[PDB]
Amino acid sequence: GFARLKRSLLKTKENLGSGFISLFRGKKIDDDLFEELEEQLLIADVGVETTRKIITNLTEGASRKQLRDAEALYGLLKEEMGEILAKVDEPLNVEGKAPFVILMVGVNGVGKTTTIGKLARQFEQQGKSVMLAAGDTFRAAAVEQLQVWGQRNNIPVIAQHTGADSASVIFDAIQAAKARNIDVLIADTAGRLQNKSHLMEELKKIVRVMKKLDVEAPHEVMLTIDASTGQNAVSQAKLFHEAVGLTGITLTKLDGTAKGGVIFSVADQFGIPIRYIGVGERIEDLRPFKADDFIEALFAR
Amino acid sequence: GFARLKRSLLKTKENLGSGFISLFRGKKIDDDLFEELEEQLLIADVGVETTRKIITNLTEGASRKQLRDAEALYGLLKEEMGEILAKVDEPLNVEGKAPFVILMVGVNGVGKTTTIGKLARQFEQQGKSVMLAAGDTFRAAAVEQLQVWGQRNNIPVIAQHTGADSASVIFDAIQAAKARNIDVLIADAGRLQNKSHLMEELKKIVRVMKKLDVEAPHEVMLTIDASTQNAVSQAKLFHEAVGLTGITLTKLDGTAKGGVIFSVADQFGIPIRYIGVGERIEDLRPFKADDFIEALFARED
Ligand SMILES: N#Cc1ccc2cc[nH]c2c1
Ligand SMILES: N#Cc1ccc2cc[nH]c2c1
Ligand SMILES: N#Cc1ccc2cc[nH]c2c1
Ligand SMILES: N#Cc1ccc2cc[nH]c2c1
Numbered sequence: 001g002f003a004r005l006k007r008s009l010l011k012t013k014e015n016l017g018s019g020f021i022s023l024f025r026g027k028k029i030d031d032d033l034f035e036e037l038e039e040q041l042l043i044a045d046v047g048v049e050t051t052r053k054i055i056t057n058l059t060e061g062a063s064r065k066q067l068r069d070a071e072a073l074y075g076l077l078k079e080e081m082g083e084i085l086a087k088v089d090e091p092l093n094v095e096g097k098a099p100f101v102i103l104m105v106g107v108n109g110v111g112k113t114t115t116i117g118k119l120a121r122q123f124e125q126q127g128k129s130v131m132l133a134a135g136d137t138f139r140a141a142a143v144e145q146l147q148v149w150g151q152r153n154n155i156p157v158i159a160q161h162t163g164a165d166s167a168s169v170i171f172d173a174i175q176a177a178k179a180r181n182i183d184v185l186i187a188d189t190a191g192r193l194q195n196k197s198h199l200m201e202e203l204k205k206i207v208r209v210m211k212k213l214d215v216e217a218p219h220e221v222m223l224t225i226d227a228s229t230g231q232n233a234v235s236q237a238k239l240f241h242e243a244v245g246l247t248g249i250t251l252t253k254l255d256g257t258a259k260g261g262v263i264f265s266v267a268d269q270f271g272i273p274i275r276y277i278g279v280g281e282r283i284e285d286l287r288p289f290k291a292d293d294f295i296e297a298l299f300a301r
Numbered sequence: 302g303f304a305r306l307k308r309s310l311l312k313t314k315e316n317l318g319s320g321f322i323s324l325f326r327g328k329k330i331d332d333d334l335f336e337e338l339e340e341q342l343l344i345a346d347v348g349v350e351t352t353r354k355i356i357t358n359l360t361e362g363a364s365r366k367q368l369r370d371a372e373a374l375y376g377l378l379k380e381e382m383g384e385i386l387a388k389v390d391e392p393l394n395v396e397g398k399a400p401f402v403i404l405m406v407g408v409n410g411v412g413k414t415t416t417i418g419k420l421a422r423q424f425e426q427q428g429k430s431v432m433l434a435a436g437d438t439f440r441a442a443a444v445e446q447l448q449v450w451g452q453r454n455n456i457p458v459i460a461q462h463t464g465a466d467s468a469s470v471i472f473d474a475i476q477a478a479k480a481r482n483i484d485v486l487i488a489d490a491g492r493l494q495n496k497s498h499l500m501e502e503l504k505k506i507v508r509v510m511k512k513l514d515v516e517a518p519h520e521v522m523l524t525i526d527a528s529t530q531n532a533v534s535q536a537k538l539f540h541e542a543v544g545l546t547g548i549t550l551t552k553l554d555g556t557a558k559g560g561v562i563f564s565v566a567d568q569f570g571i572p573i574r575y576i577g578v579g580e581r582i583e584d585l586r587p588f589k590a591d592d593f594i595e596a597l598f599a600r601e602d
């Protein structure tokens with residue numbers, strides 16, 4: 001089962017889920033064993049504190065049943081890691097708002113703009129009318145590409161001149177979305193790396209200006225991060241969460257990275273729903289995150 | 302690849318998968334719509350019981366999600382139909398036995414003998430040695446076709462005179478396969494005229510097999526023809542008569558009634574090992590439920 005997800009997770013599977021099978025084969029449960037396991041979890045980008053949590057519950061659970069063969073750790077690990085992901089299994093529901101405003105935050109070059117396009121096309125396939133706000137206002141090439149993408153797919157894109165105030169663009173977009181009975185408004189934002197404090201105050205300004213038109217907006221604050229960037233994904237999540245308060249995460253580029261295990265760190269450290277995972281190039285490969293599917297593909301033996 | 306798979310399903314896609322799109326376009330979610338959808342599933346050979354389950358789950362999930370637009374039923378239906386096939390998505394693994402014995406059951410004229418040849422060539426291509434047993438012993442023309450095929454393809458075929466005891470032929474083939482360290486033995490009657498006979502003959506075959514290897518047959522594989530509820534009915538008969546462990550469904554291409562795969566999956570819960578979607582050896586595809594669903598529900602809008 002799950003042949004496509006298993007292929008996407010091939011490099012992750014070398015260290016997590018099925019990768020544990022060779023690590024445990026014919027070993028006994030002792031400190032040597034748990035030390036090897038901790039090393040492997042850290043190599044897989046699971047994170048220092050998440051790994052310590054797993055080893056602790058795993059060691060206590062082994063002791064209680066007086067488990068002796070390391071092979072018996074497998075089911076316990078699958079349960080422990082499964083519960084980490086279950087806590088952030090919650091599909092995004094955009095129904096019933098006029099418009100449902102998604103604020104897309106995150107650094108440039110990690111699939112934020114790709115994710116906007118795929119979400120837009122999915123929502124329109126669902127029968128919703130979508131509009132985009134080109135809030136990354138100082139990147140003239142990014143804004144023009146977004147506008148060209150909108151013209152190609154008959155989706156309105158609200159934009160202003162290079163250097164325009166992003167909070168102004170997004171205000172004008174909410175106003176236009178409301179006038180045009182738009183169901184989902186997806187607002188891009190700047191993702192420059194220099195000067196982190198400036199970007200964060202810019203996002204807080206956007207949120208305050210939105211609330212001049214709708215106090216429930218933004219209805220979703222969605223971070224996009226790229227699994228191939230390993231722990232940098234965690235550090236980005238922390239920065240954006242502390243600044244504007246995330247309500248959802250999209251984790252892209254799971255296919256072809258050995259660092260997919262960063263999902264556990266993201267899930268455990270923040271408890272924010274992971275709404276979507278990106279497991280390939282298709283629109284349909286931005287998949288709603290389903291924890292038990294992910295675990296099954298990972299641990300399938 | 303995936304593009305050939307989509308093309309091979311175009312006729313079934315008229316009414317299932319992407320065939321649902323025109324049905325939902327601009328409609329409200331009400332009983333008229335669910336009635337039309339139920340009728341469309343039944344026409345596609347999904348089956349009364351399986352259709353009732355799909356419609357019930359879809360209706361409940363639409364309510365809970367508070368859906369407004371019929372277009373949004375598409376993703377829920379893709380998930381419901383995908384879950385039916387996920388539950389029978391276990392691949393056949395023929396490795397590690399001397400020989401791995403596949404007992405091929407099914408009626409005559411549904412691609413059973415074609416499937417035997419394609420599997421034999423696929424296994425050979427993977428580096429495994431293969432033997433066939435001509436267990437359809439009262440049909441002289443069929444035995445000779447199988448012998449001719451084995452001659453043409455340099456694969457040994459164990460056979461006896463017309464009217465030989467099937468279980469004895471298969472007994473002799475397992476003996477020979479074991480002596481020659483053959484990796485895979487594929488054993489071929491499929492007469493439904495007196496079904497009480499055919500079924501008792503299968504139980505005799507299995508009993509005799511177990512004299513030489515208590516694990517044999519390692520797989521009991523039914524073959525049925527997707528272009529034929531006859532295929533649903535043959536699976537019921539063989540399922541109750543013998544313990545099926547796998548199912549091959551042939552001729553999915555060029556037929557517009559692709560729902561039998563869903564009815565078979567849901568009613569019996571037996572793994573679907575292979576689907577035949579064309580004339581080439583490789584068009585007998587190891588079944589991947591996720592690939593199949595994606596091809597069936599592929600949409601470009
Ligand atoms: N998916 C997606 C996508 C593809 C191209 C562009 C260009 C600007 N935004 C885009 C989004
Ligand atoms: N265009 C624009 C616009 C309109 C109102 C406010 C309020 C704060 N920024 C704004 C920008
Ligand atoms: N693939 C295949 C195939 C087609 C015809 C016969 C007849 C006896 N074995 C057969 C195998
Ligand atoms: N050829 C043949 C054969 C040999 C032994 C037994 C035992 C039961 N059936 C058998 C058939």
Ligand code: NA
Nearest residue numbers: 390391392588
């Ligand atoms: Na499968």
